[PDB]
Symmetry: C4
Subunit: 230 residues, 4 copies
Amino acid sequence: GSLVPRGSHMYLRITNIVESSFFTKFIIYLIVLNGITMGLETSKTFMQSFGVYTTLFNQIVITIFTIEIILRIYVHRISFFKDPWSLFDFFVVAISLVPTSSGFEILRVLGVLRLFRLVTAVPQMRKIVSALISVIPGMLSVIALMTLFFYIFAIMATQLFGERFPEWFGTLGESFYTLFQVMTLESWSMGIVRPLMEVYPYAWVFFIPFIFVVTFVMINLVVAICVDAM
Amino acid sequence: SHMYLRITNIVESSFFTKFIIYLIVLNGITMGLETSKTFMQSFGVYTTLFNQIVITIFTIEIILRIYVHRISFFKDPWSLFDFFVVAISLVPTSSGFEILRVLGVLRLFRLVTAVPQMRKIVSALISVIPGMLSVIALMTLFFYIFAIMATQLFGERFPEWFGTLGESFYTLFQVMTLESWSMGIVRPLMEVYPYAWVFFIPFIFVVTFVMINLVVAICVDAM
Amino acid sequence: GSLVPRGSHMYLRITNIVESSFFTKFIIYLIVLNGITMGLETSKTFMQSFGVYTTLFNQIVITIFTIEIILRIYVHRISFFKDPWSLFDFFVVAISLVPTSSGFEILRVLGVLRLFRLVTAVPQMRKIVSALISVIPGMLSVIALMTLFFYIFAIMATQLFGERFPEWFGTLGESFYTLFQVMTLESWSMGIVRPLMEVYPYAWVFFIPFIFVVTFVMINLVVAICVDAM
Amino acid sequence: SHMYLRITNIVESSFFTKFIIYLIVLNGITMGLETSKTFMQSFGVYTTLFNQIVITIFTIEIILRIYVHRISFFKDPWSLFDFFVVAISLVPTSSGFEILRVLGVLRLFRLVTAVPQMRKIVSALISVIPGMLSVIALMTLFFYIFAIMATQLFGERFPEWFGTLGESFYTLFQVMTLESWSMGIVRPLMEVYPYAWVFFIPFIFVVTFVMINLVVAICVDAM
Ligand code: NA
Ligand code: NA
């Protein structure tokens, strides 16, 4: 493979650096250091004392991480952009590269996602994430079914309850949101359906069978993962 | 037979199912759009005419499917669902109640009908239900007995929650889901009836114990 | 067996009556009839119209049921009082025999328990109750453990929170009650622990580990029934 | 050895364990009674003297158990628990905090220590925990990342729920238990931050998905 390596005179030179155990260790060390520093940046008292420290520390770590991804791309070439873990690394570092201002501060908040590089860089963490994720394919049909089910009941509820209950059902999205809440069973009766039954006494004919189905499916979804994994 | 084979090759074709599924999805999209009051002031007429067109196509389709499948049609659960959900959608713009207009949205479940693999998951989910009916039966009897009890123990001083058998069923269901059962129901009940806990706690143990066994059944009965 | 039968001249006479399929059918028929009549007695409107009907119907059914248990005891003799289903039958009919007044009306309400004779008299209902119940022996240790656990944390909470929160923790029983509620996770935070953290900011150090344990055990209890039954 | 064998037969005996268990249960009963303010006005002195007597016996017991078991004692988890829970109970009537007086009730968990079969269930429950640490670790990291995010997205306008990393941890735990997460937390958050749902819904999916897999593990890993 590798098609046309960078040398392989300096290709191998940087490859042994990148491929080393020290290289991974140092990076992980910085992940943990930056994770600690990010919790510290949460205190307004710490930021009034050591604000400058952590801010420069931050931009320093991010420079190292960018160089790291660059070195890893020269070594792994095309293989890099075919590796989900490396892709996550790339995108979570790229996010972190957007200037101190501009756009919105969501990009600054999403910067904290780089701490998930602990999962990337540490094996066994990969292994558990990998195990959890591979369970998802045998769920897509049920998820698909459930999504269609929510969509149909959201449309119904929007048009049955939206005019007299705009906050909870005024809009398709509002209805989706509220139906999700009912599925988690959070205040479904005292907070949503009892108030609904004061105008619409048969509202129970809608939410109870909704609750049976959504619950029945969730149970089968779990049993699936119990059986499909066992 | 004569023209029987003629329409059968139409109905039985790959094109025929595709076109129908295409209309399911199109009509499903059109139904979400009909939710927006802004969309309906602009393209209201469009979507309304689109709707009556789709429903006419679906009616012709079911007719064609019955001529081909004859008796087999009304013995097929999927076709029956198709039939009833299209018939629902045939009820006039007014008259009766508007539940029928709302029940029209149920025709989107024809996506399940028309797409294989969706049948498969619905089929898998449903076949799990027979080995549950005895437990369901037991639970229903249990709800019935405790609903009657709650009606006559708590109904006079707590009419909204227990004044009526139906109200009691409803409240007991809520307690089973554990939703506000204490802060919202049993603590208030205990300001009048301090031993109310002797009723709802064992009720909660039983209903929970059964649900756990009901699930374990589906864990076991399906495996 | 049977030691000394009643004859067996009339012993066999009543035995064939009692042992018949008709005998069971008739009784079941009355269970269902009385169950229907009991729901009807819930309506204040029905009781103003057909109150006399159902009340006499009730005392009639109860007389038949007492005769039934009597006939069953003469036939089954000692075997009767060794049969859990017959014992339930006996006690649920005896409850139903207590006079129209006297004591409390709990005895009138407990009368509705006789509808569970549907489970007794119908096979397959026995079978599911039997299946559910037999699962309980392999649970007694965990239940025992949990009961001890609740007892210890109830004592702790009574003495940590009872003075400033008499309703929720003023008394061992109040504490038991509240801890049960926290276990069902019902309003545990917004309704109990957040108000508790306004005086006692470390209350979370008590309820969070309580919630982990009680939840962890519940999960293992279920897995037990999953494995012990599978 | 000399008197080593003399006390060993005492400590190792069936009588010795029984008497101790007998005192566990007696002291446990006495601790519930000490909860009643009425009982304490009548028999307060009795139970207090009973308490110091039991604790002195327990201290002698642990000393005797250490002379017999020597090094083996401090390598036995059950004996360590015994030791620490008795030591806790040795702290003077005042000084420090009264948490130590409350932590004294933990000595009732010596019922688990002293009664076999109780060990067995505790042992079974605990051995299940090693095959969970990776998932626990993943979840803790996940909470940490989302807590930091919530602190800086919602902390200024919602100090009580998200003003501080610790507050955010607490609130996120609550959302994970699904307790009032919508009516009590996310709907209020959405009156200021209408896209807050983009944060809590995926948070709820993940935390739930993991819990389900965590359980399935214990279903599988134990079977
Ligand atoms: Na409300
Ligand atoms: Na409160």
